[PDB]
Design a protein around this ligand. Structure first.
Ligand SMILES: Nc1ncnc2c1ncn2[C@@H]1O[C@H](COP(=O)(O)O)[C@@H](O)[C@H]1O
Ligand SMILES: [Zn+2]
Length: 180
DNA sequence: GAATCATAAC
């Protein structure tokens, strides 16, 4: 198939689709995640093309901080009165091209959350906090990731609120209901 | 039988 039509390039199409945009400014766009893994799941993307955090440098530090500020503003504007819990961060090894910040509510109540890989990509060290990425760029000038990130996606299922171990995705989804 | 694992997608 073509380069432009490859599945890994899909965010570059979605980020230009007005029906998926929830916020736009001179530097970034916010879209709904197409396969949301919680009740609220957005992606913040710069207009400028940066393939992944591997290509980030100090020239991008203001932009990474702006992406974080915009993510916080979207939470306030779209889900603020609910006083929900959110995390903002990056997957250590992404699958989709074009740098994107995940802004995700911590219920993880969604039919698109289907497997252990989904859970652990948001609930282990695989999920890099946005503030931690920002501080690494500021102090070290680039983002580095340690070996062993793919192995974390295989860790047994453990609740993020109470650390209980769960034997299956169905039982995990059932367990999460108690933390609403 | 249900759920996960491990692969494949030409
Ligand atoms: N075309 C798309 N538009 C919007 N979100 C997408 C699209 N394709 C995949 N996604 C989401 O993009 C994210 C890519 O994950 P990652 O590359 O691991 O950061 C996931 O949360 C997907 O659900
Ligand atoms: Zn729990």
């Amino acid at each position: 198939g073509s380069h432009m039509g490859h599945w890994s390039q899909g965010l570059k199409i979605s980020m230009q689709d007005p029906k998926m945009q929830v916020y736009k400014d001179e530097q970034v766009v916010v879209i709904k995640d197409k396969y949301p893994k919680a009740r609220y799941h957005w992606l913040v993307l710069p207009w400028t093309s940066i393939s992944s955090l591997k290509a980030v440098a100090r020239e991008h530090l203001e932009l990474l901080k702006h992406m974080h500020t915009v993510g916080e503003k979207v939470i306030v504007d779209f889900a603020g009165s609910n006083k929900l819990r959110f995390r903002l961060g990056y997957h250590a090894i992404p699958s989709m091209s074009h740098v994107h910040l995940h802004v995700i509510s911590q219920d993880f109540d969604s039919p698109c959350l289907k497997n252990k890989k989904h859970w652990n990509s948001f609930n282990t060290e695989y999920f890099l906090e946005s503030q931690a990425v920002i501080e690494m760029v500021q102090e070290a000038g680039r983002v580095t990731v340690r070996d062993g990130m793919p192995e974390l996606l295989k860790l047994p299922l453990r609740c993020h609120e109470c650390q209980q171990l769960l034997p299956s995705i169905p039982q995990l989804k059932e367990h999460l209901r108690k933390h609403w």
